[PDB]
């Protein structure tokens, strides 16, 4: 039985889900057509995004590792 079985009537879109940039969290997709060629395509595009983040990857990931380590050391 739903919430209507109470005898009720009204008189994720929570603001915890909202964010002023990026909109609402959660993706619209993930359903509807994922297949062979969709998996190969996001392999190609994920390799492209990893390749674009290969520019500064050593220095960026080293800075992030050191900052989370000293942030967990201090607080």
């Amino acid at each position: 039985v739903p919430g209507l079985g109470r005898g009720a009537t009204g008189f994720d879109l929570n603001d915890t889900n909202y964010d002023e940039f990026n909109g609402y969290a959660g993706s619209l997709f993930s359903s509807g057509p994922y297949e062979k060629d969709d998996e190969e395509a996001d392999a190609i595009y994920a390799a492209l995004d990893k390749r674009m983040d290969e520019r500064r990857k050593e220095r960026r990931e080293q800075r992030e590792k050191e900052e989370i380590e000293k942030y967990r050391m201090e607080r």
Binding site: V1, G5, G7, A8, T9, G10, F11, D12, N14
Partner: protein, 141 residues
């Protein structure tokens, strides 16, 4: 991690509202890890056995129980709705909408008086009671 009871689907919520005949069903709609809901649940826990003669307090997760999101307009982090004998008791708080609380009050005596007002106006039969305070201004000086 509260001592307040939790309802985990729509049947538990609607039968928890229908369970009480002489007590206000106080229902917090929100997530336990939210800071606003954490402060509101601290306030509801510190008065849960004070107002036990005329109220009952239930916590409801929005992710676990999402069917009341559209009807009750549960789009703020915490909402606190008040029911008495299956009737939704609205409260003219001054916030603009009367249906929910929708913020975390820090005074536990204000929550006691809001529950006591809902009880007095609901046993009298009103679907809308008037809060014994105006919450439009935050009264900070």
């Amino acid at each position: 991690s509260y001592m307040l009871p939790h309802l985990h689907n729509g049947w538990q919520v609607d039968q928890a509202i229908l369970s009480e005949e002489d007590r206000v069903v106080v229902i917090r709609f929100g997530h336990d890890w939210d800071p606003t809901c954490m402060k509101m649940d601290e306030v509801l826990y510190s008065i849960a056995e004070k107002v036990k003669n005329f109220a009952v307090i239930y916590l409801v997760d929005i992710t676990e129980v999402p069917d009341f999101n559209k009807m009750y307009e549960l789009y703020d982090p915490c909402t606190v709705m008040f029911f008495f004998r299956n009737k939704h008791i609205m409260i003219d708080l001054g916030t603009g909408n009367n249906n929910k609380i929708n913020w975390a009050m820090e005074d536990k005596q204000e929550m006691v008086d809001i529950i006591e007002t809902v009880y007095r106006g609901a046993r009298k039969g009103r679907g809308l009671v008037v809060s014994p305070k105006d919450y439009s201004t935050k009264y900070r000086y």
